[PDB]
Amino acid sequence: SKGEELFTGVVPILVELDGDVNGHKFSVRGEGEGDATNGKLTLKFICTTGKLPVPWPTLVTTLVQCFSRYPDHMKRHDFFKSAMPEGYVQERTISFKDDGTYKTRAEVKFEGDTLVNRIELKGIDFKEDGNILGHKLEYNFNSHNVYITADKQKNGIKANFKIRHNVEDGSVQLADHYQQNTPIGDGPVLLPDNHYLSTQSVLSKDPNEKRDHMVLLEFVTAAGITH
């Protein structure tokens, strides 16, 4: 696409999230850059409202799949880049087993020469001393495949996947993801055959940043179609 050629270089990324979970409102602001050619990106996020009322790992999937490395033999199946620069809306339901639910609406688009992910997040019916609101999750992240299928009737795609969050006691907190994406603009986009993205996320801290924050390195690649 014309859209994919916008990602040949190193693209600045701005992430802005406004959140409201069980009436706890918060905001997050991330800045970094993405290298789609190689399928890696680096971001640093600050909670600008003080202490984050949920664990950072529970926000990772919400906080730019346009930066995936698609292999040349799969380029015809990159919806995310095809929708650029005007971008796409991305919506999820994230259902935390035996706990509450996030509902997210994001717009991913270029503002000037920056790729911006603007998100609204509403979380309902969380337990005040469960794993999320009690901050009982480990500050780490497992690798996962996101299985993507076309949604022809919406000129977009959908995806389903389970995220497994390690709990401090060694148990596992599941977060079932249901995702849908739709072009912001009108213009044609690539509607893909079934395939998946493989993602690895690496979380760290900056000892010199007193604000509640998350340093993040992500690898993302596409697979599952064979020329």
Q: Please state the overall shape, judged from the principal axes of the Cα atoms.
A: globular
Q: Give the termini separation.
A: 18 Å
Q: Into how many domains do the coordinates divide?
A: 1
Strand content: over 45%
Number of helices: 1
Spatial strand sequence of the major β-sheet: 1-2-3-11-10-7-8-9-4-5-6
Largest beta sheet, briefly?
11 strands, mixed, barrel
Please write the CATH class name: Mainly Beta
The CATH homologous superfamily corresponds to Green fluorescent protein
Written as H for each helix and E for each strand, in order along the chain, the element string is: EEEHEEEEEEEE
The CATH architecture classification is Beta Barrel
Q: Give the tally of β-strands.
A: 11
PDB class: fluorescent protein
Keywords: beta-barrel, fluorescent protein, Chromophore by cyclisation, p-Azido-L-Phenylalanine, cytosol
Assembly: monomeric
Entry title: Dark-state structure of sfGFP containing the unnatural amino acid p-azido-phenylalanine at residue 66
Write structural notes for this entry.
The chain has 227 residues and is mostly beta strands. The protein has one domain: Green fluorescent protein (Green Fluorescent Protein), CATH 2.40.155.10. It contains one helix and eleven strands. The protein has one helix at 79-82, and strands at 11-21, 24-35, 40-47, 88-96, 101-111, 114-124, 144-151, 156-166, 172-183, 195-204, 213-223. It has an eleven-stranded mixed beta barrel. The longest helix is centred in the middle third of the chain and has 4 residues, at 79-82.
